[PDB]
Design a binder for these strands. Sequence first.
RNA 1: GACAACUCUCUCUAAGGAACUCGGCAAAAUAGCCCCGUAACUUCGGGAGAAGGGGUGCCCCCUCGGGGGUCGAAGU
RNA 2: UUCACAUCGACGGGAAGGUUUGGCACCUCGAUGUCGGCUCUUCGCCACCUGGGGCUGUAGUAUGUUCCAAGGGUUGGGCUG
RNA 3: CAUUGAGAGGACCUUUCCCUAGUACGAGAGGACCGGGAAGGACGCACCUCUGGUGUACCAGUUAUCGUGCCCACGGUAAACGCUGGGUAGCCAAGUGCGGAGCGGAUAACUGCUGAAAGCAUCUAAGUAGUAAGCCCACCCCAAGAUGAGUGCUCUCCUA
RNA 4: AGAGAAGGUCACGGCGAGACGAGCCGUUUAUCAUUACGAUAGGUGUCAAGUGGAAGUGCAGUGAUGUAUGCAGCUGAGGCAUCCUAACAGACCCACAGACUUGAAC
Lengths: 221, 116, 48, 118, 121
Amino acid sequence: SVDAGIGVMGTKLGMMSFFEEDGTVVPVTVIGFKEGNIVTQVKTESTDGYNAVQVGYERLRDRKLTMPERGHLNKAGVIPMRHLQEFRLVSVDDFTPSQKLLFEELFKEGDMVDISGTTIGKGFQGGIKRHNFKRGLMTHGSKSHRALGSIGAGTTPGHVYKGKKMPGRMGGTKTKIRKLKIMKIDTDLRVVMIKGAVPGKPGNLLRLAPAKIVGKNIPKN
Amino acid sequence: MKHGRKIHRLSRPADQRRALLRGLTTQLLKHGRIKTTRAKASAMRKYVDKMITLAKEGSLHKRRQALGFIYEKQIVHALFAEVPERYGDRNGGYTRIIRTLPRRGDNAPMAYIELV
Amino acid sequence: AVPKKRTSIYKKRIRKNIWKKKGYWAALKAFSLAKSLSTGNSKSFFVR
Amino acid sequence: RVKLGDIMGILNKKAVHAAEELRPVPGIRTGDIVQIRLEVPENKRRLSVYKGIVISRQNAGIHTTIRIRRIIAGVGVEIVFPLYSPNIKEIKVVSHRKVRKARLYYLRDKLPRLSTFK
Amino acid sequence: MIQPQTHLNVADNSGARELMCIRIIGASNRRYARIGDVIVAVIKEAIPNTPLERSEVIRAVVVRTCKELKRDNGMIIRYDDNAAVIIDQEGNPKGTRIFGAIARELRQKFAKIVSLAPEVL
RNA sequence: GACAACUCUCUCUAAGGAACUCGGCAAAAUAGCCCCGUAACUUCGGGAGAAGGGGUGCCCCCUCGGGGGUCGAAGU
RNA sequence: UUCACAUCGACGGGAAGGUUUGGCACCUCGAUGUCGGCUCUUCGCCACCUGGGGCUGUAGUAUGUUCCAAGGGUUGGGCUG
RNA sequence: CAUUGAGAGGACCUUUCCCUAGUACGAGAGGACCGGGAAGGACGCACCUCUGGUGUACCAGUUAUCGUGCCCACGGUAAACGCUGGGUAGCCAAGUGCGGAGCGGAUAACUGCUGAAAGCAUCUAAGUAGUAAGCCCACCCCAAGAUGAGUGCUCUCCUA
RNA sequence: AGAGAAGGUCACGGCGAGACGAGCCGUUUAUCAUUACGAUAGGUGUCAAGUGGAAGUGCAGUGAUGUAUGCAGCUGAGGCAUCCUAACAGACCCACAGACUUGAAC
Ligand SMILES: [Mg+2]
Ligand SMILES: [Mg+2]
Ligand SMILES: [Mg+2]
Ligand SMILES: [Mg+2]
Ligand SMILES: [Mg+2]
Ligand SMILES: [Mg+2]
Ligand SMILES: [Mg+2]
Ligand SMILES: [Mg+2]
Ligand SMILES: [Mg+2]
Ligand SMILES: [Mg+2]
Ligand SMILES: [Mg+2]
Ligand SMILES: [Mg+2]
Ligand SMILES: [Mg+2]
Ligand SMILES: [Mg+2]
Ligand SMILES: [Mg+2]
Ligand SMILES: [Mg+2]
Ligand SMILES: [Mg+2]
Ligand SMILES: [Mg+2]
Ligand SMILES: [Mg+2]
Ligand SMILES: [Mg+2]
Ligand SMILES: [Mg+2]
Ligand SMILES: [Mg+2]
Ligand SMILES: [Mg+2]
Ligand SMILES: [Mg+2]
Ligand SMILES: [Mg+2]
Ligand SMILES: [Mg+2]
Ligand SMILES: [Mg+2]
Ligand SMILES: [Mg+2]
Ligand SMILES: [Mg+2]
Ligand SMILES: [Mg+2]
Ligand SMILES: [Mg+2]
Ligand SMILES: [Mg+2]
Ligand SMILES: [Mg+2]
Ligand SMILES: [Mg+2]
Ligand SMILES: [Mg+2]
Ligand SMILES: [Mg+2]
Ligand SMILES: [Mg+2]
Ligand SMILES: [Mg+2]
Ligand SMILES: [Mg+2]
Ligand SMILES: [Mg+2]
Ligand SMILES: [Mg+2]
Ligand SMILES: [Mg+2]
Ligand SMILES: [Mg+2]
Ligand SMILES: [Mg+2]
Ligand SMILES: [Mg+2]
Ligand SMILES: [Mg+2]
Ligand SMILES: [Mg+2]
Ligand SMILES: [Mg+2]
Ligand SMILES: [Mg+2]
Ligand SMILES: [Mg+2]
Ligand SMILES: [Mg+2]
Ligand SMILES: [Mg+2]
Ligand SMILES: [Mg+2]
Ligand SMILES: [Mg+2]
Ligand SMILES: [Mg+2]
Ligand SMILES: [Mg+2]
Ligand SMILES: [Mg+2]
Ligand SMILES: [Mg+2]
Ligand SMILES: [Mg+2]
Ligand SMILES: [Mg+2]
Ligand SMILES: [Mg+2]
Ligand SMILES: [Mg+2]
Ligand SMILES: [Mg+2]
Ligand SMILES: [Mg+2]
Ligand SMILES: [Mg+2]
Ligand SMILES: [Mg+2]
Ligand SMILES: [Mg+2]
Ligand SMILES: [Mg+2]
Ligand SMILES: [Mg+2]
Ligand SMILES: [Mg+2]
Ligand SMILES: [Mg+2]
Ligand SMILES: [Mg+2]
Ligand SMILES: [Mg+2]
Ligand SMILES: [Mg+2]
Ligand SMILES: [Mg+2]
Ligand SMILES: [Mg+2]
Ligand SMILES: [Mg+2]
Ligand SMILES: [Mg+2]
Ligand SMILES: [Mg+2]
Ligand SMILES: [Mg+2]
Ligand SMILES: [Mg+2]
Ligand SMILES: [Mg+2]
Ligand SMILES: [Mg+2]
Ligand SMILES: [Mg+2]
Ligand SMILES: [Mg+2]
Ligand SMILES: [Mg+2]
Ligand SMILES: [Mg+2]
Ligand SMILES: [Mg+2]
Ligand SMILES: [Mg+2]
Ligand SMILES: [Mg+2]
Ligand SMILES: [Mg+2]
Ligand SMILES: [Mg+2]
Ligand SMILES: [Mg+2]
Ligand SMILES: [Mg+2]
Ligand SMILES: [Mg+2]
């Protein structure tokens, strides 16, 4: 999954409504930022086998960090940071450890982004909620209701299939949301407003990249 | 699920849980310290404090509010008497919770809630 | 649904050992707790 | 310098002051008879006039909202207005009605008579 | 939110008092008639001695819902009843004069119908 | 104690209103009192509480039911 | 219209399948049990629609027939065990 | 701590309308291929700003009745709300967004170019060209128990 | 054998994480003086928000009731402040410079 362009990380602050001059109301997510988005490490095809750049995000007290990690960020000469992440480019010449990213440079207005985040955990969920199973009859004689159904065929094959859909734990995962739009950037509050919903509740941690378009931003294969 | 449902259920239905909490507070304000289960204590914090904050203002309105919570009048009047004196400078935080050895019969974790 | 067969001596011995391992973690909590109450410095804890 | 929860509340205060600057908005409660004039994206010549009673007011941020009920040609119509909308031009209080609730949803079930204005 | 078996008030002269929707058209397999969709209805109750007999299959466009229409102003509209107007396959109303309010949302596909309206919303 | 799936005992549900189903099964709806009104049919006893409609709280005043007020979204 | 082979194809023949109605009685009799709906799958291709083609008695639109193709789709009701 | 990705999965669906153009085609009536653009359907992934549902956290009315000495005012009960009218946070859809991209690779049928065996011909025997919702990569999650257990950065191994 | 490496588990305060384990965040709560990083939960103060005009005392009324004091009173699962309470006391696991061979280098 080679990624087009450097991304940045941010924090979901919650959603509000935002007008346009002509009275079109757009619901927008407001994505805040914190001190960070500092290039931590750079990986050369020679050295690592591939081309990538590790940006750290959330700053932090030095105590809370572990000695291996602190010693990772003193090799860089950067401030202590909670979350590290990698972006995979096809060319890294522009980047030095300790270099800083600004989201005002990378993202203009009306540009397309891709928001990766972690989803709301809904816990252990039934067949209905998890796979949209139609529920069986509520009344005439029927004892089933929200139950799973039959789970397989008869004597043959005589075992349930792999991956046959069943109740299990739902949510709480890395999820991409493709091709969103950027409505407004506030330099004052350093915030980015985005049309639509992004995963997870406020206080979340997001990763925004310039949108991969399978024809035109990416290696053909 | 519950996301951000904050209440203490105490494994009882609404009515009972109310009455239980009222009871436990008239107990704490009568005796000044008591021995209960960790959950009951933690749940009871809020209502203890509601009563104290109530008495700090002293208005007839507030006094009728407390009267309609605590069961025993006498404890209420004594509350409105003592509190300005004892707690006047304390902003919040009127209760200490000190845990102990668990119970013998069920091994339910115990606790000591103190009027501090 | 019933047990078509009877459970082999050794497998049962493993399942019951698992259930006996919980006694081990409760023994660590118990030990740590005694070493706490044995310095008499804890104001969060009380014994009579 | 701004902490983040602050940012969330602050952006609404900014947008509502910036919106109340161009176009000052009346005090408007439930039970008020109201006249509103909309600029439509088509039909520049005349601005559409909606009269009616306010059945409810939901307070949120910039998107704060008003619900207007009126009987039109014997068909009950309720309409919802974003208050700080740019496409609204004038709004005013025609008259006040005396009501005890925070929302009158009971107007549906009553007679046409109470919803009748102008 | 008109769906099959729903009853509807007729908004025009055409001589039907009530319709029962049996289908929704052009929406492929959607089950919801919302404002400005063509539904196939049948006539339940009619106005006597009129060109329209009860138990007729006819086309109508849905002009009023109890569900709520959202324009882009953030503006919202909710009527007190369901109503549709009986048409041709040409877009022209069979009956010549319409009651009630309508919306500017119908101006695109139906000119005739917005023309004959006593009020526009 | 905790507050998953799921089953059971219950409350509520936007638009629609039997499209469910073997079948309106189960639910929901109706309900007391006073007043007006009450069909085919009949063994003239019935049908019949047919159907369908109105009134109902709390205050004063009059006659021993009537008028006036006043709350509530709603008065057995 | 002419023209067997666009499309049909009489009289006959050569096959595949194992979904119909059957023959057999190898099978299980103790509590290895038939048809419809619900829920939930899954696979075949003899392709109904969607993708590409050849021929036409294909002007065009729409067909007809056939080739490759099973990725996806395949409604809601009145009626019946 | 951060990752490569063998392998595994999810999803790559479809309809009307509008330009092209009333252009080819036809005597007319009718009416295109190809390639662009919008709106829909179903399905999938998220979400709560709006519209709502619930919301036994709360707020208000209100009947019966027993408590708090009595009026006032509150408390209990009318299962697991007495009955109603509202509702924030949550969860939710009927609400809101987004998705289905590939002058990438190799093929099936088929259309082909050079061209022999048969001094002619022939899409095939040499060699090669187009081309499918199919096949494979790309897209989206998982993933080194991938025992073939990967690579990368950093940290730590005291005292006698 | 003493000690307790890096780290982990436990304990303790928690959650937009959770059937349980797991996950994640905290654990003396800074200093500042020019950024951010040292408030986890509860309480308290204030604010968004909800409900819809408290109780008491006045006035009007024969009275039920209305009206003023007053966007009141209650609530505030959400934000922001503030260490007032509880994050006390602590415990356990854990430290043969990494067997053997062969080349290359020095
Ligand atoms: Mg969760
Ligand atoms: Mg169903
Ligand atoms: Mg059942
Ligand atoms: Mg087997
Ligand atoms: Mg009760
Ligand atoms: Mg009870
Ligand atoms: Mg509180
Ligand atoms: Mg709202
Ligand atoms: Mg009045
Ligand atoms: Mg008929
Ligand atoms: Mg006129
Ligand atoms: Mg329970
Ligand atoms: Mg409903
Ligand atoms: Mg309804
Ligand atoms: Mg309805
Ligand atoms: Mg109906
Ligand atoms: Mg029927
Ligand atoms: Mg039926
Ligand atoms: Mg059916
Ligand atoms: Mg019944
Ligand atoms: Mg019932
Ligand atoms: Mg009901
Ligand atoms: Mg009645
Ligand atoms: Mg009733
Ligand atoms: Mg009579
Ligand atoms: Mg007769
Ligand atoms: Mg009689
Ligand atoms: Mg009869
Ligand atoms: Mg009678
Ligand atoms: Mg009757
Ligand atoms: Mg009868
Ligand atoms: Mg009645
Ligand atoms: Mg009545
Ligand atoms: Mg009355
Ligand atoms: Mg009077
Ligand atoms: Mg009266
Ligand atoms: Mg009234
Ligand atoms: Mg009345
Ligand atoms: Mg032949
Ligand atoms: Mg035999
Ligand atoms: Mg058996
Ligand atoms: Mg085939
Ligand atoms: Mg085809
Ligand atoms: Mg063909
Ligand atoms: Mg032809
Ligand atoms: Mg297929
Ligand atoms: Mg398939
Ligand atoms: Mg299929
Ligand atoms: Mg069918
Ligand atoms: Mg970490
Ligand atoms: Mg990865
Ligand atoms: Mg792969
Ligand atoms: Mg494997
Ligand atoms: Mg794949
Ligand atoms: Mg594709
Ligand atoms: Mg021409
Ligand atoms: Mg096209
Ligand atoms: Mg689409
Ligand atoms: Mg919402
Ligand atoms: Mg919200
Ligand atoms: Mg409600
Ligand atoms: Mg809500
Ligand atoms: Mg008494
Ligand atoms: Mg009493
Ligand atoms: Mg009560
Ligand atoms: Mg009692
Ligand atoms: Mg009883
Ligand atoms: Mg009940
Ligand atoms: Mg309620
Ligand atoms: Mg959607
Ligand atoms: Mg190709
Ligand atoms: Mg080829
Ligand atoms: Mg050829
Ligand atoms: Mg040649
Ligand atoms: Mg040739
Ligand atoms: Mg060849
Ligand atoms: Mg293809
Ligand atoms: Mg495609
Ligand atoms: Mg490894
Ligand atoms: Mg090995
Ligand atoms: Mg190796
Ligand atoms: Mg250590
Ligand atoms: Mg814990
Ligand atoms: Mg752990
Ligand atoms: Mg400590
Ligand atoms: Mg706090
Ligand atoms: Mg907090
Ligand atoms: Mg008052
Ligand atoms: Mg009250
Ligand atoms: Mg008086
Ligand atoms: Mg308010
Ligand atoms: Mg401080
Ligand atoms: Mg302390
Ligand atoms: Mg070595
Ligand atoms: Mg050696």
